[PDB]
Amino acid sequence: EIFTLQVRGRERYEILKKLNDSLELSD
Amino acid sequence: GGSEEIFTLQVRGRERYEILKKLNDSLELSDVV
Amino acid sequence: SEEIFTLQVRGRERYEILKKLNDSLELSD
Amino acid sequence: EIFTLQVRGRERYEILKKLNDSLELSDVV
Numbered sequence: 001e002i003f004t005l006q007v008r009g010r011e012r013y014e015i016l017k018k019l020n021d022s023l024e025l026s027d
Numbered sequence: 028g029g030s031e032e033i034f035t036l037q038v039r040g041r042e043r044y045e046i047l048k049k050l051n052d053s054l055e056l057s058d059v060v
Numbered sequence: 061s062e063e064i065f066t067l068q069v070r071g072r073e074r075y076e077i078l079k080k081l082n083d084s085l086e087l088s089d
Numbered sequence: 090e091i092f093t094l095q096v097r098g099r100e101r102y103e104i105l106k107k108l109n110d111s112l113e114l115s116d117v118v
Contacts, residue, residue: 009030
């Protein structure tokens with residue numbers, strides 16, 4: 001199941017992308 | 028208020044989406060970053 | 061008072077991210 | 090470089106701990 005999240009702001013997107021990528025690797 | 032720019036993040040799995048949505052919603056309200 | 065917990069965070073940028081999230085959640089909660 | 094993050098309350102602590110633990114395993118940042 002794939003979901004899209006709309007993120008406002010460049011830095012906010014980069015933070016949430018990093019967290020997403022981290023969780024993908026760690027889970 | 029806040030940034031005018033918008034970017035789509037793809038998330039795999041409901042649990043992970045819920046965590047990230049919670050953070051995203053928090054940041055929209057607080058505007059910390 | 062709300063009880064204080066600590067996390068040891070490795071790296072300045074990692075710390076800065078988690079601090080911003082902490083502060084955001086304090087404000088939105 | 091280790092930074093100590095202070096967090097108020099269990100709910101925020103557990104979210105941030107999950108993230109910190111993930112980041113330690115992945116080293117994304």
